[PDB]
Design a binder for this molecule. Structure first.
Ligand SMILES: CC(=O)c1nc(NC(=O)[C@@H](C)NC(=N)N)sc1-c1cncc(N)c1
Length: 130
């Protein structure tokens, strides 16, 4: 309905704002753009489903997220990809892992503090009805 599309529009507005706050954080610059295959050749074969904050923005705008659970699955994908690609004990790997976990924790913390549980529940019930 028209009411329901207003609901999803509010969700998109909320998700753009959260994603922008993540993308301007200096700690998360490594996650703001897709991995360039020319710079990193072994990536595109180790990570089967790349995800980054710029691609998150595109998906918001393509109306791919109808719930924040859908959005958090891509945030979690950004994190788990980073952990999978950087499993070694060396400092570079361990710095990226720390930032990946901080990206995840920050996203979950903003949503917990700022997204009304009933708003998300409404989003899920509209989704489950389609
Ligand atoms: C996405 C990601 O996790 C990532 N990890 C990296 N790790 C490394 O460079 C070293 C420390 N570890 C290793 N095992 N290669 S660089 C990198 C990345 C590559 N291209 C573009 C963007 N933005 C990020």
């Amino acid at each position: 309905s028209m009411q329901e599309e207003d609901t999803f529009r509010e969700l998109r507005i909320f998700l753009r704002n959260v994603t922008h706050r993540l993308a301007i954080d200096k700690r998360f610059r490594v996650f703001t753009k897709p991995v360039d295959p020319d710079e990193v050749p072994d990536y595109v074969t180790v990570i089967k489903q790349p995800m980054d904050l710029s691609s998150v923005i595109s998906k918001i705008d393509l109306h791919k997220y109808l719930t924040v659970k859908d959005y958090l699955r891509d945030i979690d994908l950004i994190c788990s990809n980073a952990l999978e690609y950087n499993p070694d004990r060396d400092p570079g790997d361990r710095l990226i892992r720390h930032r990946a976990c901080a990206l995840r924790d920050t996203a979950y913390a903003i949503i917990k503090e700022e997204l009304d549980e009933d708003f998300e529940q409404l989003c899920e019930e509209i989704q489950e009805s389609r």
